[PDB]
């Protein structure tokens, strides 16, 4: 009697607000308690479409539990074995997501018990085998397992001695390495067109996250990957890994980590040309959260290349224009990809200097760049995050009359600082970094129009720097802003000797701009004739 009256209220509320985390979870509980367990999984399968739920730990925890219950039911074990395999795929995937969220927002214990439960899930499915969505899904999920295993190891050593950090970090390299060895999933074996994009997406995030970690650990040491595979790829490593990750007293025969064979590890270091393609493919794996982007950007500060922020944004926001003619205004409707790329460069620029300041007081007991994505803390200020989350909900046009007021003003507040307008909190060094990256990134483009856009901003920012350089040239102090969007650091204070060199670069870029326009004029008149 009561369950039915409550079912109507939940369902009628989902009519208008179908993305609420708690309201959806209460519906899953109703279907579970009312013996309609099949309809429960049917909802989670259909609610996973919404990404706001995929990012919630409470949701994935509910999807795992309800999926595990449905496997033990007769309505599943009998009705269809293909549906049984389909439900197993969803379970392995939910575990992976849940394992990711747990590592970032929980302690070492709860994450361990989950990985151990994850291990039991893999063990149970490896006997089936096959060659379909479940077989292809199982292989990719094995990589996430080892990947998250490495993330767990580095997390444990974060609060241990340095000698312990060596033993754990070495074992972590093994896990990440094994995860990178896993081949790309065969997209041909998947059923749904969305599933093909998903598994491909997850594969990229596995390679990008693991790959950058392999390099982050083997940068300081020579042939680091070789020593690891020689000593730890042996059966001794499996016993050292299992005993390290899980409670050694648990049965090792019934565990996947102990039974799995680690044969023919390529001991190959990831290539940068491949990582860039992985990062771009993994941009959507975390819904483009500013924590994910700022992390990828920080990786390339130690690597010999620039982060493909242009391709990242062009991949995230397709319809968003490159540049707006209203560079004078700060209206949030005129937001463009450059406004975002220039913003992301600032967050990465400030984030790297803040980590360095904490590291100097902490004496690099743990290198700032060497922590994995889930473990490390929030890498951006809450103000910078508020802007990104606000602009994203506006570009995607997922706003509400009760939000438009807040989302607009939160964006408009910073457009001045991004476009170097009146009272921008930009430090002279930061503006240069923008002009340098925008000039460099723009020249490498093939479309003469796209070159003009990026190189155009570089000229714009350069013009906004020169007045500040003359002031530093004359040994006159620039006014330090009040509560700037991007923190000022004295470690990058421009000095007299550097003023003349920048004035050159500025005049050069101006000429590069005129050269591009010149080639566009040649193309224009040729199209007229």
Task: Find the angle CA(81)-CA(203)-CA(225) to the nearest 5 degrees.
Answer: 125
Q: Tell me how many domains the chain contains.
A: 2
Q: Domain boundary residue among 283, 305, 330?
A: 283
Shared domain check, 344 and 258: no
| Cβ atoms of 323 and 340 closer than 8 Å | no
302 inside domain: no
272 Cβ contact list (under 8 Å, min separation 6): 303, 304, 305
Shared domain check, 348 and 244: no
216 inside domain: yes
Identify the experimental approach: X-ray
Task: Determine phi and psi for 271, rounding to 5 degrees.
Answer: -95, 145
Select from 256, 251, 241, 253 the least CA-distant residue to 123: 256
Q: How far apart are CA 10 and CA 8, in angstroms?
A: 6
209-to-57, 148, 168, 380 alpha-carbon distances in Å: 20, 10, 18, 19
Q: How many residues does the structure list for the chain?
A: 529
Range of the domain at 190: 130-283
Q: How far apart are CA 213 and CA 170, in angstroms?
A: 12
403 inside domain: yes
Q: How far apart are CA 134 and CA 88, in angstroms?
A: 7
Shared domain check, 149 and 276: yes
Q: How far apart are CA 56 and CA 46, in angstroms?
A: 16
Q: How far apart are CA 28 and CA 39, in angstroms?
A: 9
Select from 156, 196, 201 the least CA-distant residue to 175: 156
Percentages of the chain per state (helix, strand, coil), in multiples of 5: 70, 0, 30
Q: How many CA atoms lie within 13 A of 25 on its CB side?
A: 16
18 Cβ contact list (under 8 Å, min separation 6): 24, 47, 50
Final resolution, Å: 3.8
From the CB of residue 108, how many other CB atoms can be counted at a distance below 10 Å?
Answer: 15
227 inside domain: yes
């Amino acid at each position: 009697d009561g369950w039915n009256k409550l079912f109507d209220l939940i369902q009628s509320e989902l009519y208008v607000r179908p993305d609420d985390v708690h309201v959806n979870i209460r519906l899953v509980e109703v279907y579970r308690s009312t013996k309609r367990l099949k309809d429960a999984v049917a909802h989670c399968h259909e609610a996973e479409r919404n990404i706001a739920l995929r990012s919630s730990l409470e949701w994935n925890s509910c999807v795992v539990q309800t999926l595990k219950e449905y496997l033990e039911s007769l309505q599943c074990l009998e009705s269809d074995k293909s549906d049984w395999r389909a439900t197993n795929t969803d379970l392995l995937l939910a575990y992976a997501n849940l394992m990711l969220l747990t590592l970032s927002t929980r302690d070492v214990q709860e994450s361990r018990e989950l990985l151990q439960s994850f291990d039991s899930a893999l063990q149970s499915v490896k006997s089936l085998g096959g060659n379909d969505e479940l077989s292809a899904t199982f292989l990719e999920m094995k990589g996430h397992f080892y990947m998250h295993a490495g993330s767990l190891l580095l997390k444990m050593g974060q609060h241990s001695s340095n000698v312990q950090w060596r033993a754990l970090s070495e074992l972590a390299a093994l896990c990440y390495l094994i995860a990178f060895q896993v081949p790309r999933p065969k997209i041909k074996l998947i059923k749904g067109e969305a599933g093909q994009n998903l598994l491909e997406m997850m594969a990229c995030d596995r390679l990008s996250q693991s790959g950058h970690m392999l390099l982050n650990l083997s940068r300081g040491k020579q042939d680091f990957l070789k020593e690891i595979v020689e000593t730890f790829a042996n059966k001794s490593g499996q016993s050292a890994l299992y005993d390290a990750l899980f409670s050694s007293q648990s049965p090792k025969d019934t565990s996947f980590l102990g039974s799995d064979d680690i044969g023919n590890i390529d001991v190959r270091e990831p290539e940068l040309e491949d990582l860039t393609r992985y990062d771009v493919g993994a941009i959507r794996a975390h819904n483009g959260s500013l924590q994910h982007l700022t992390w990828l950007g920080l990786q390339w500060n130690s690597l010999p290349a620039l982060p493909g922020i242009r391709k990242w944004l062009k991949q995230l926001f397709h319809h968003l224009p490159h540049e707006t003619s209203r560079l004078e205004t700060n209206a949030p409707e005129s937001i463009c990809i450059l406004d975002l790329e220039v913003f992301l460069l600032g967050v990465v620029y400030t984030s790297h200097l803040q980590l360095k300041e904490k590291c100097n007081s902490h004496h690099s007991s743990y290198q700032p760049l060497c922590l994995p994505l889930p473990v490390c803390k929030q890498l951006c200020t809450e103000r910078q995050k508020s802007w990104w989350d606000a602009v994203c909900t506006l570009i995607h046009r997922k706003a509400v009359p009760g939000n438009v007021a807040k989302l607009r003003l939160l964006v408009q507040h910073e457009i001045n600082t991004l476009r170097a307008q009146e009272k921008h909190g930009l430090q002279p060094a930061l503006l240069v970094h923008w002009a340098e990256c925008l000039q460099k990134t723009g020249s490498g483009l093939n479309s003469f129009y796209d070159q003009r856009e990026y190189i155009g901003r570089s000229v714009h920012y350069w013009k906004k720097v020169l007045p500040l350089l003359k002031i530093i040239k004359k040994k006159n102090s620039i006014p330090e802003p009040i509560d700037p969007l991007f923190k000022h650091f004295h470690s990058v204070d421009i000095q007299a000797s550097e003023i003349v060199e920048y004035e050159e670069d500025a005049h050069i870029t101006f000429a590069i701009l005129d050269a591009v326009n010149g080639n566009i004029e040649d193309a224009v008149t040729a199209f007229e004739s």
